[PDB]
From a paper:
FIPV is responsible for the deadly systemic immune-mediated granulomatous disease, which has a mortality rate of nearly 100% in cats. Within the genus α-CoV, [name] (FIPV) is in the α-CoV 1A species, which also contains a few other closely related viruses, such as transmissible gastroenteritis virus (TGEV), porcine respiratory coronavirus (PRCV), and canine coronavirus (CCV). The SADS-CoV nsp1 and FIPV nsp1 structures were refined to 2.1- and 1.8-Å resolutions, respectively. Their space groups are P212121 and C121, respectively. Each asymmetric unit of SADS-CoV nsp1 and the FIPV nap1 structures contained two and four subunits, respectively. With the exception of the regions encompassing amino acids 105 to 110 of SADS-CoV nsp1 and 106 to 110 of FIPV nsp1, all the residues of both nsp1 proteins can be built using the final models. Therefore, we could judge the characteristics of the same subtype and different subtypes of α-CoV by structural comparison. This comparison showed that the overall structure of FIPV nsp1 is conserved relative to that of TGEV nsp1 (with an RMSD of 0.53 Å), but it has several differences compared with PEDV nsp1 (with an RMSD of 1.87 Å). The overall structure of FIPV nsp1 and TGEV nsp1 is highly conserved, which shows that the differential amino acids (Asn2, Cys35, Asp71, Ser91, and Phe102) in TGEV nsp1 and FIPV nsp1 will not affect the stability of their overall structure. From the surface electrostatics, the structure of FIPV nsp1 was more similar to that of TGEV nsp1 and the structure of SADS-CoV nsp1 was more similar to that of PEDV nsp1. Compared with other α-CoV nsp1s, the ability of FIPV nsp1 to inhibit IFN-β and ISRE reporter genes was greatly decreased.
Numbering used by the authors:
A (entry chain B), B (entry chain A), C (entry chain D), D (entry chain C): 2 to 105
């Protein structure tokens, strides 16, 4: 029903990340659910000002919900109180942490 | 390293809940990690207004962190940006949801 | 399915209103859906400051949702972005307005 | 006095939408009030970040007021506390919901 992943958590580094059309992010979420999140970092919602992006009308991976989190494409302006953070393509340093995630 | 639990999520009902000395909540967390959370509900932090308690100076079970969550005694006024919600003893209804938790 | 109602809208007057247990507000919602809202006023969420009650752990009628609104018991601290306002027992002045409502 | 409509509600998808001179939106509101809102979506005000347009000095259909809502041309910058959302021409999916609307 869900899967555990190790993901690098970025709470310190300003990053400029790629965004993609909705259907592309759906596909990349499915890829990462199968293969893991190497090449991505998790930015907690409370550090969202670390994330810059050139096409903010396009999407990044969102992590949403209570408990085991759902993954779905979101804008960086996503205002839901259930937003945990974003999983974005970046090569900065951080702290590897354990997540438990499912596809929305 | 962690354990999955099904916990009733309460986002609708006001609950008056017991708080306890810090050391007692530590023991209650261990018991619940072993035996499950029947009779408790998870109240997300954005609905902290739902939760009231007798002893402002005593603690409830806090759910903290990014990813798989840590369990630790917290005050109901805990301001940490890492606070996900509370697990409190209450008899109200809710929605059963999956959690992945570890002892802090 | 839903019903249209004329309801006095209060955007100006401070009101002290009764709050009730959840089950009681459910019954009051059903009564008002059958018989109308005379004796109540609608306070829009943007003037929620106008409403006070002596039991802040008890409920009033909430008006929520997009389009035809749902009616359900809420606390005066209800933070949902879907909250339109409250329907509360009060005898103040206001502007009579047309609503379209259904029971949640 | 008013009419009920089924309208696709969009809370998920970024939409680049046409904006028009004020007088043209007046006429489009009249047409849609007669013929329905097929091809349009309702974006709630709390997801106004989803909507972009080319001419930010030109207008879209605004949904305003307490209760049965008024339809009136607005800018996407519309600051009124009575703004419920926008009805905009867009291709995306959504959730069909019932509305009760009148022309301002």
């Amino acid at each position: 029903s869900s899967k555990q992943f190790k993901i690098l958590v970025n709470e310190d580094y300003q990053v400029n990340v790629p965004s993609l059309p909705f259907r592309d992010v759906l596909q990349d979420i499915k890829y990462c659910y199968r293969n893991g999140f190497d090449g991505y970092v998790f930015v907690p919602e409370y550090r969202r000002d670390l994330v810059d992006c050139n096409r903010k009308d396009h999407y990044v991976i969102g992590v949403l919900g209570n408990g085991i989190s759902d993954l779905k494409p979101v804008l960086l302006t996503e205002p839901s109180v259930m937003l945990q953070g974003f999983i974005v393509r970046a090569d900065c340093n951080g702290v590897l942490e354990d997540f438990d995630l499912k596809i929305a």
